[PDB]
Structures are given as C-alpha cells and as structure tokens.
Design a protein around this ligand. Structure first.
Ligand SMILES: Cc1cc2nc3c(=O)[nH]c(=O)nc-3n(C[C@H](O)[C@H](O)[C@H](O)COP(=O)(O)O)c2cc1C
Ligand SMILES: CCOC(=O)/C(=N\O)C(=O)CC
Length: 372
C-alpha cells in the first residue's frame, strides 16, 4: 500500500524499497581514514535490499574541504573501507561510495603544503559563506587556482582511480558528486566558470568536465555501477547559473548520450531539490517543481530526488512518478531505522545540528536509538 515499499530494479541491484540513505559528510573519518565508527553508523542504517550512499569521499589529496572526511585514493583507505562495506553487505544492503572533490570550497588548512585549492576559476567563494575549520571555528574561503587542461585530465584520472578503488573495497558502485558548487559544479555553473578555453563559455564547454568524469568512471567500472548527482538550481557556495533548467537539460542530454554509446544505463541520476540549503530550514515552488519534473522526464533512467523530504512527500514523489527513489539526509541522521519507521509510520526522532560535523565516534553519530 506504501509506494516507498514497492521493489525497484536499479540496474542490476534489486532494491526492496525506495528509501535511500543520502550522502552525508559527518567528519568521523579521522585523518581521512575510514574508522570503525563509520561501520557501526552505516550498519545501523543498512536494511535488506536498501540502498545507501556514503558521505562524500576524497579522490585525491586536494579533494577535501571538511576535516576528517574519508578518502579512497590510498590502499590504507581501501583496506578500512572494505570492513565497512562488509558489515553493510552483511545486512543485505547495496552501498555506493560518493566521490567528492570540493574544488575551490576548501582552505589552506585542508590542502597539501597549504597550497591554494583548485578550481575552474580564480574567483573565490564570497564572504557570504564560511568554511568549517578543524577546530570548529569558521574560516574564509581563499582564492583558488584555475587549473589547465592537463591538470583537468589528471583530476579525471583521480575519479577513475578512485572508482576502481571503490570496487576493490567491495562497493557496489560510486556516485559522482557533481552538485552543490563543488569542483564539477564550478565547471558547470556560468556564475563560476569564467574560462576562455575549451572548458568555458558555451554550455557544451561547461559540460565537458562532468562528461569526461562520467565517461572515465563508466569505462572503468561499468555504467550500471555509476550514479551521478547534480543540482542545477542551488543556493550553496555561489553556484548560480543564468539558466539552470537549460544547464540541467544539457547535462541530462550528455548522460543519455553516454548511456547510448556505452550500451548500458547509469545506476541513476540524483538531483537536489532547489529548496534544500545547508544554512537553514527548507524562485516559486511551482518553478522548482517544474525543474525537477522536467529533468526527470528528460533523463532515460532512474531518478533519485533529495532535499527536504518527509514520509508524506516521499510517498507523493513515488506515487506521482516524480522520482523512482527518494534519498533522506537529516532524518536518517537521527533515525537509524528510518526505513522501518517509514514503513510503520512510526514517529521520527529529532536531529541535532550541533553534532553533524563533530568528531565523536558515538555522540550524535551512532547513539540515536532505534524504535523502542
Ligand atoms: C550533515 C549533512 C551532510 C551532507 N553531506 C553531503 C555530501 O557529502 N554530499 C552530498 O552530495 N550531499 C550531502 N548532503 C545533502 C544530502 O545528501 C541530502 O541531499 C539532504 O540532506 C537531503 O535533505 P534532507 O536532509 O531534508 O533529507 C549533506 C546533508 C547534511 C545535512
Ligand atoms: C546544500 C548542498 O550542499 C550539501 O548538501 C553538501 N555537500 O554536497 C554539504 O553541505 C557539505 C557538507
């Protein structure tokens, strides 16, 4: 009776329900090494036939813009990820590793040798935004270094190698974080990308980087193990575009083309609701709904929606055909058994923003209780 619990074939993965763990940075992976705490956390939230997406994971030493976020670019990181994937698979869940490069959304403190973060541009995020520092204070986003096309090709290889490392750790697949003003989105958004070479200017040129990243990982591990996350309209880290809908449709067209040329469909397209922001709660609601349905209708495959969803809104999204899967973030922080609570329509427990990004392996992380 609940459409969130009708099964869904996500390529080769048979999911038993459509409630997805959205990718959430939590900063418990001390020194960028996956910790046992992550295993307990993902294990708590894993269900038989349920789909989990990990926190954004570094693809290279320049990828981070948060403290104690995990990487998957070293063999040490792969070894520790394997233990976490093992306990998630022990419960019959499917798990993808989100590959995350923040680009200009970093700080000297997070870069090797304190170097400038890399980006499409030299323009910094404005002082409207602040970066969380390792000591819990807020820092200023610095001026990034605009990389050339050889360096771009090396970042693409960082995605390729990290996708292979994810498969070696036992992940079922990876998600490309191409959203929220991070590195890929710094190429996509014409409010950021001021390049005059073949990666800037036109919409085709601005889409080159994400196309090359997706093509690289598809070639490496197979289309059916690759999800792609974008957010054509978002209020995060000055990632504006003059025509968000056309930008989204240009990206979708390239994903459709990659699928045709590879003869296989991606695992999914994951799109953030424009209402979702990092700095608080929640143009017009109809324009935002138009954008989501337009992208879904344009994409030849599985659509995951995310951002501000509740039990009722997730049911509606699946019932109306607005999405195939619904990913939940904050409610999954505070309800380890969110899937069961949604099935039972049991009351949900509140989440505590204060411990979203702290380092404690337990407090605010794995000590939210299950249903009594
Ligand atoms: C603490 C926190 C960390 C997040 N980290 C990521 C991330 O690393 N990568 C990403 O794509 N989205 C990230 N998100 C956005 C979520 O994936 C998800 O889309 C969002 O939380 C959905 O909205 P909801 O919290 O109302 O369910 C994060 C959200 C929160 C609250
Ligand atoms: C508001 C959209 O941005 C996000 O959700 C996000 N990463 O993708 C973060 O907040 C970094 C922790």
């Amino acid at each position: 009776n609940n459409p969130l619990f009708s099964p869904y074939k996500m390529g080769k993965f048979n999911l038993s329900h459509r409630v997805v763990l959205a990718p959430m940075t939590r900063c418990r992976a001390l020194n960028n090494i996956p910790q046992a705490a992550l295993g307990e956390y993902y294990e708590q939230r894993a269900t038989a036939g349920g789909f989990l997406i990990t926190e954004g994971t570094m693809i290279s030493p320049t990828s981070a813009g948060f403290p104690h976020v995990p990487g998957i670019f070293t063999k040490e990181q792969v070894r520790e990820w394997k233990k976490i994937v093992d306990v998630v698979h022990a419960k019959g869940a499917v798990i993808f590793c989100q590959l995350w490069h923040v680009g200009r959304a970093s700080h000297e403190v997070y870069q090797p040798a304190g170097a400038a973060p890399i980006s499409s541009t030299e323009k910094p995020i404005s002082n409207r935004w602040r970066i969380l520092m390792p000591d819990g204070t807020h820092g200023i986003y610095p001026k990034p270094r605009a990389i050339g096309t050889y360096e771009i090709s090396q970042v693409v290889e960082d995605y390729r190698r990290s996708a292979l490392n994810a498969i070696e750790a036992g992940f079922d697949g990876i998600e490309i974080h191409g959203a929220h003003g991070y590195l890929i989105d710094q190429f996509l958004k014409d409010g950021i990308n001021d390049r005059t070479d073949e990666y800037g200017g036109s919409l085709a040129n601005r889409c080159k980087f994400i196309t090359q990243v997706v093509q690289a990982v598809v070639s490496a591990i197979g289309a059916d193990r690759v999800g792609v996350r974008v957010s054509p309209a978002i209020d995060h880290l000055d990632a504006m575009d003059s025509n968000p809908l056309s930008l989204g449709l240009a990206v979708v067209e390239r994903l459709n083309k990659i699928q045709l040329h590879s003869g296989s469909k991606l695992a999914y397209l994951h799109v953030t609701q424009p209402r979702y922001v990092a700095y608080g709660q929640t143009g017009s609601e109809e324009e935002e709904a138009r954008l989501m349905r337009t992208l879904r209708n344009a994409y030849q495959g599985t659509f995951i929606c995310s951002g501000g969803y509740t039990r009722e809104l997730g049911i509606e999204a699946v019932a109306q055909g607005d999405a195939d899967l619904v990913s939940y973030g904050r409610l999954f922080i505070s309800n380890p058994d969110l899937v069961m609570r949604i099935k039972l329509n049991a009351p949900l427990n509140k989440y505590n923003r204060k411990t979203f990004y702290t380092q404690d392996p337990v407090v605010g992380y794995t000590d939210y209780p299950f249903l009594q």
